[PDB]
Amino acid sequence: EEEELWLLTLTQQFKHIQKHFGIDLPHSVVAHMDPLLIKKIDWETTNALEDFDITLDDMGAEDAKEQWGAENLSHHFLPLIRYRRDLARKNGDRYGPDLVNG
Amino acid sequence: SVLAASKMVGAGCATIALAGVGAGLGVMFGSLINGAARNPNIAKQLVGYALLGFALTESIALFSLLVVFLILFA
Amino acid sequence: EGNSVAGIIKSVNETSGANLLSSLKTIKAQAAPIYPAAASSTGYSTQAKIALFGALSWILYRADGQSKAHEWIVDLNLNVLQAAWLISFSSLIPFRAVYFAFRGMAPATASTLNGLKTFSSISL
Amino acid sequence: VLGEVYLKDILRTPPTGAIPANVPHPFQTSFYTYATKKLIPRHWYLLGGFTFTITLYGILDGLRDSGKKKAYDEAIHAGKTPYTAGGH
Amino acid sequence: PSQNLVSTFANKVIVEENLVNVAEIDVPFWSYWLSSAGFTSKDAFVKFAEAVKPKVAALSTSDITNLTVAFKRANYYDKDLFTGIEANVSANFTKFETEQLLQIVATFDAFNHSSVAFLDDVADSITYCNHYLAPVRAGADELATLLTYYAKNGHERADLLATVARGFSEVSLGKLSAAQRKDTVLSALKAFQTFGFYPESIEAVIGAALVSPAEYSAEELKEVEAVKVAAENALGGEFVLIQEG
Amino acid sequence: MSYSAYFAKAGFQFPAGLSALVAGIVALNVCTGRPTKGTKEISNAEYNATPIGYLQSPDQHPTAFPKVPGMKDVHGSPHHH
Amino acid sequence: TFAQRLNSSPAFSSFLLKREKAESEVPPSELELEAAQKAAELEDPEVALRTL
Amino acid sequence: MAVTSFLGKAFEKYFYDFSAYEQFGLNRFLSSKGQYVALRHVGFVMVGVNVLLAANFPFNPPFPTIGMCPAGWEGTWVCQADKAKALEMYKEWKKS
Amino acid sequence: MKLLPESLQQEAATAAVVASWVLWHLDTQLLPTIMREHKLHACWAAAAKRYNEKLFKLNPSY
Amino acid sequence: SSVRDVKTGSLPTNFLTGVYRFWRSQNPAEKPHDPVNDRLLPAVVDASDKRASIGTWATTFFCTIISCNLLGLMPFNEAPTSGLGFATGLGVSVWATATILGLSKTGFKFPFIFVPLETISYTFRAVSLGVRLWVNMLAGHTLLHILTGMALALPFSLGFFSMVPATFGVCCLLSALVGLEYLVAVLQSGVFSILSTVYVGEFNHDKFIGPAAKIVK
Ligand SMILES: [Zn+2]
């Protein structure tokens, strides 16, 4: 139970989204549950890249499409990253993934 | 009223082009049936071409009918 | 409005061992999403009544102008010929199949969400 | 432990209290952001096309009005009626 | 007798004191637009800083970047104010966009103001809280300012380096003028050599110094060739230029 | 449960900027510069001189459900040259 | 099941879809029906603790 | 007590439940349901045009007659082809 | 029957107003909503494998 | 300042998603020679920046034209598209949009007797794109009005309930004509937007600023 809040909130949030998504989920409940994903989606519509996943399909870029999806949901690991970085800071060490040679 | 008389005669002679465009449109749709019979796996693509083809072919009818209007009600 | 899983954790840690199996259903019902119940049925909206009265005023104004027109009777019969097709579309169109075809038009509704799996986010 | 403060605005649970307001897009908020971010940088070709068609149709209205006024002028100069009255 | 009246009205009511006294209601708005219009006087911004100083911690992100850009243009550094602005950025870092953070980091780089927590929150916000193509819309001078900021403060964040290395390309460096491109390439190559991080997009930096080496001096060319050999060793091959075809 | 009652709570709502669309169409139809179809801009002395029925042309008032095509509701200006 | 959730959705309360059922378009699988039964059985958390 | 609730429920019961293809037992006369929908469409058109023509008549039609009258107005004021002559004939027919 | 309207410029401006309103409503009200749904589903479907492998590597529960 | 709430998976959202993805698929992006990665991602983003939004424009024109075309078939209503200025203003608007894009690509420079002949052949697209849709809408309404008069004449001069088979046949013909008008409304909206996409995709092509320097292995 050192990090069970972060894993269990990921499980619960995705279970609610997957349970309700194409059926009756409002947009407000989505933007409440995942505000940074909605922010990264709104950046694409704002910066005229609203067809970017269509462009990556037209260019045949499956690796870049995987990177696009993974970089949009990359904030789901940010609470764990900040928690482990603060743990390593209190222990006096450095966080491993932050370094180029880690 | 010889001008209006010639307007009726000219519009009636003006719509002869709809014959040629109808013969061409029937040729194109018969070839659409043929091309669906040859390769039905792409048939829903071919119908699209047919519609696009019909599109441009139809325009040659409407430039006929426009002249008819420009003969009749100008 | 705090994290509901944090409330689950606090409520489970706050119970005693004798009270746990009794209180699990209430801890489940406390941190469960709000699905707001149906309110009392009211009158129509201001915008709904504006839409219906504006549609009726447009229909009356257009029928009046169609009556004033030179070929008035064929105008009023064109209205019958169009209303016949609006009637027949209610009988012909397979609205369930049309609904699910439109659901297949969008990729968000064409497939299920393929996302987080259980074995990755498990916490033993 | 990993507290709730690490999850603050990153990751939320489904709402238990009430359904919130929908988060607006920046274009839904202001027309200035839509106009300067997407309407002018992306759709100025369409706006120039509409401007060209309104300018051109104003030119065509000017030509039609000039021809109509010319016909009216020679009609009143010839001494005849420019318009047919009709029967009521 | 109207000229003596307009001379009495012109020296007592329309003054700088009533200008900075009507500018107290929305002070990041007024300081931003007055600094853009050119009004960069020190004493007005001394008044402006103690105007914002209570209500900094509850400002919006647009008002924070407006106030920070305004104090960059006025060149007035208030340590308690920028501690408040840094605490605002560190408080709700998820709301800030990448362009706002690049303007804020440019102001914090003009002065030598940094904390470890502020640097981690800006890097977390650019990397995780923002779109991964937001460095592409940035402009390489802003990203080089951020790279030199993190290099000067010695804060090593390889995820942020992999994020802001995306913004360096032929496009963003081609948008710059020649002197500004030389300055940006020198700053980015120095920061990448400091961190020991050589991404696949460093070559678009290196190429921007080697397609046109007429503006570069001999010691700068030695620096660029040092980073070029280091990137050749890191990326695993030799550096060629591509022609038109 | 479900969010069905949440969406049944909100009534009918217009498209978001429909007032601007109706305002643009109405401002195109009323701000034309030219006078109303059928009417002619006459002088104020002529307008105050003539009665109502003489000022109304018969071509602008067609009969509602005319028994004969071309019936007009009013007969305007029997005094003419 | 997904079909039951579609039947409880607002779209099947609308006038042109009042008498329609989503099972008639795509019926649920045997795995989906047995998993809906299993999830209804495990909705009691004490039963889930005892079962596990 | 509400009017629009009863109107919605009544139109639902008329739209979905009330079916004159089975209530009148029209499956013996007609082949299928779609044939009934087509014939009810054309019957709606026929009844509508007859109600309009039947509604207001006798009148001089603006649509071109094919040289046929209603069999009671050979040359009164309904079959007149010239419109001003038909108008004055309508006037001397309305004075009666 | 007349082919030409009373003003061609008025009808052209009506078409421009209607199409520009459809453009603004599409870009502003419809396409943000469409892309919120579509890009949520598409981001999850594009990142399922990488996300689950990264979370499987981070998870110390096994 | 508060926006409305939207159900995810609504039928208008799904319909407009399919329509937008269609008109976006009409002009696909070109595959680069290099593999798409973080080195190539600003080149891809700038390629998307230089490409005109023909998906948004074609969806705009499709939605407005199918809305007016279907307005023509509602009772007490005529299509706005059957007006000359409306439909031909839309046509000249698409032609001028394609021309303004192509001129801006060539540095705002206007373009051996092949050049006036190709100029007339290109300039006739402005006439054809609007006159096709306008002529089709005008012809359908005009044909229905002429046909309706003949049908009205049959029960006006043969009794209201005295001639059943000929009135039934001519009303079958009229009803099939209105169904054809529904088909022509949908088809001419789709045709206008497809020809819009090809006319602007003639000028949508631009230069790909790829990598000028690389590590070879
Ligand atoms: Zn009509």
UniProtKB/TrEMBL annotation, chain A:
Protein name per Swiss-Prot or TrEMBL: ATP synthase associated protein ASA1
Protein's organism: Polytomella sp. Pringsheim 198.80
Automatic annotation (TrEMBL), chain D:
Keywords for this protein: Membrane, Transmembrane, Transmembrane helix
Ranges that cross the membrane: 43-60
Protein known as: Mitochondrial ATP synthase subunit ASA8
Protein source organism: Polytomella sp. Pringsheim 198.80
Lineage of the species this protein comes from: Eukaryota, Viridiplantae, Chlorophyta, core chlorophytes, Chlorophyceae
From TrEMBL, chain E:
Domain of life, per lineage: Eukaryota
Protein name: Mitochondrial F1F0 ATP synthase associated 32 kDa protein
Protein species of origin: Polytomella sp. Pringsheim 198.80
Full-sequence portion shown in this chain: 77 to 321 of 325
Automatic annotation (TrEMBL), chain I:
Domain of life of the native organism: Eukaryota
Name listed for the protein in its UniProt record: Mitochondrial F1F0 ATP synthase associated 14 kDa protein
